[PDB]
């Protein structure tokens, strides 16, 4: 089999075992998967040439997953650049940091009534984590004072994010995240902007796989579908069985739409400008993790259209090896290239759902 299929095959083997109980390596059986071969080869070319994106060096790693938002099907996944070894695309050992803000803080805040419009005012000013004198600093180290919720997301304020989680509460945030396939042994306010505050087993935290599936719920109206690498298995006895995810409601369509409208500005005028495409209706969010006690261990980007969701992680094998300079550009560029490939031959815009009304650049609940 081709090298570019190694990561996908590994996950196919795992899901076949989960769904049927058999190991396709020891038990003969035919399996039909959801990988888009051309898309997969394209992702490999994005990773391993200078055609689409320029890298600072050949050591910087990239790991991404592309999901079909309508059914959770994984169409492409590549865990590294330059048999069935560790697949970073599904590993939850790295911190997706600020990329956690939309699904951890804002989505549940809107879903549960903390905010009723994208114009609601919030206050970006010096703030400490609840119960401490430990300051929450914004990525740019500044404060913009009284601003709209939409601008808060546009410029990725950490202050506003942490106070939002405080309002949502650790219980509800946990439940909301669980509905999006993400979990932690225990929730803390630090999780408002981090997925790896402490070492945890594989089932907890974020990975490109989980993040792609999570953001797909935004794209499709609020429905969560588990990552699906297989659609059919034909066992040696002749029987043929199909596999598809029924889906569950993770958030109201009104919540999904509002979140989408704000993440559109992240790209058009905000921190996600590096992924902006004027001809495509898409929304996204940049992500950055931080060291303890400009450099960072991880730089992420997650974006989606009404058809696909793609989560991207970048960083070095040893987190202590920092991303620096133009290295921070890669995540958004990998996404930009892939989504172009996936959309240029396409790609409708979202339609404001029942229960919401528009007033200029903002959206409000009735």
């Amino acid at each position: 089999y081709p090298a570019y299929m190694d990561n996908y095959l590994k996950e196919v083997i795992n899901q076949v075992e989960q769904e049927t109980g058999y190991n396709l390596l020891t038990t003969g059986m035919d399996v039909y998967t959801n990988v888009d071969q051309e898309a997969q080869k394209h992702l490999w070319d994005i990773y391993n040439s200078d055609q689409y994106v320029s890298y600072p060096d050949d050591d910087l790693q990239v790991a991404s997953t592309v999901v079909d938002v309508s059914n959770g099907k994984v169409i492409a996944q590549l865990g590294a650049r330059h048999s069935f070894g560790t697949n970073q695309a599904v590993e939850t050992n790295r911190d997706w940091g600020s990329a956690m803000k939309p699904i951890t803080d804002y989505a549940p805040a809107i879903e549960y009534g903390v905010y009723d419009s994208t114009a609601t005012m919030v206050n970006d000013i010096p703030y400490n984590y609840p119960g401490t004198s430990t300051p929450v600093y914004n990525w740019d180290r500044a404060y913009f004072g009284n601003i709209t919720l939409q601008y808060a997301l546009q410029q990725s304020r950490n202050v506003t994010a942490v106070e939002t989680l405080n309002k949502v509460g650790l219980d509800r945030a946990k439940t909301f995240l669980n509905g999006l396939g993400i979990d932690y042994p225990s929730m803390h306010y630090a999780n408002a902007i981090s997925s790896n505050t402490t070492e945890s087993n594989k089932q907890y935290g974020a990975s490109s796989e989980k993040m792609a599936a999570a953001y797909a719920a935004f794209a499709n109206g609020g429905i969560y579908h588990k990552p699906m690498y297989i659609n059919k298995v034909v066992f040696s006895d002749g029987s043929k069985k199909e596999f598809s995810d029924v889906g569950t409601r993770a958030m109201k369509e009104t919540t999904a739409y509002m979140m989408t409208e704000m993440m559109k500005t992240v790209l058009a005028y905000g921190t996600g400008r590096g992924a902006y495409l004027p001809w495509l209706a898409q929304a996204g969010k940049t992500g950055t993790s931080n060291y303890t006690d400009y450099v960072a261990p991880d730089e992420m980007f997650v974006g989606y259209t009404r058809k696909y969701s793609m989560a991207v992680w970048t960083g070095y094998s040893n987190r202590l090896t920092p991303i620096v300079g133009d290295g921070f550009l890669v995540a958004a560029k990998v996404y930009r290239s892939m989504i172009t490939y996936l959309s240029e031959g396409s790609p409708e815009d979202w339609n404001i759902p029942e229960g919401l009304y528009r007033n200029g650049e903002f959206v409000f609940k009735n």
Binding site: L9, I13, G28, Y32, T33, N231
Partner: peptide
């Protein structure tokens, strides 16, 4: 022998 196919049902691997 386990044959794997892509989303267009074309063979991509034999494991």
């Amino acid at each position: 022998s386990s044959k794997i196919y892509d989303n267009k049902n074309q063979l991509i691997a034999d494991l």
